[PDB]
Amino acid sequence: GPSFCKADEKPCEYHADCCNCCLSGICAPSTNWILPGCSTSSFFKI
C-alpha cells in the first residue's frame, strides 16, 4: 500500500487530499516553518 494523495499547487475541499495540505487557495507540502494552517489531531485512539 504505497502513499496515495494529491500533489501541491492543486488545492482540495478538505485537507488530506494532498500528500501534505490543500487549502482553497492552493495545495502545499508539509515542509513549512512559520505558516500555520494544518492542525489535525485525534480526539481519541483508533
UniProtKB/Swiss-Prot annotation:
The modification 4-hydroxyproline is found at residues 2, 11, 29. It is found in: Secreted. PROSITE patterns: I_CONOTOXIN. The natural D-Phe-44 form of the peptide is more potent than the L-Phe-44 form. One of its GO terms (molecular function) is toxin activity. Expressed by the venom duct. Disulfide bonds join 5-19, 12-22, 18-27, 21-38. Transmembrane segments: none annotated. It comes from the Eukaryota. Keywords: D-amino acid, Disulfide bond, Hydroxylation, Ion channel impairing toxin, Neurotoxin, Secreted, Toxin, Voltage-gated sodium channel impairing toxin. GO terms for cellular component: extracellular region. Negative results: does not have effect on sodium channels Nav1.1/SCN1A, Nav1.3/SCN3A, Nav1.4/SCN4A, Nav1.5/SCN5A and on potassium channels Kv7.2/KCNQ2, Kv7.3/KCNQ3, Kv1.2/KCNA2, Kv1.3/KCNA3, Kv1.4/KCNA4, Kv1.5/KCNA5 and Kv1.6/KCNA6. Iota-conotoxins bind to voltage-gated sodium channels and act as agonists by shifting the voltage-dependence of activation to more hyperpolarized levels. This toxin acts on Nav1.6/SCN8A > Nav1.2/SCN2A > Nav1.7/SCN9A sodium channels. Produces general excitatory symptoms upon intracorporeal injection and repetitive action potentials in the frog cutaneous pectoris muscle. Natural peptide (with D-Phe) is active on nerve, but not on muscle. Synthetic peptide (with L-Phe) is not active on both nerve and muscle. Belongs to the conotoxin I1 superfamily. The cysteine framework is XI (C-C-CC-CC-C-C). This is Iota-conotoxin RXIA. It comes from Conus radiatus (Rayed cone).
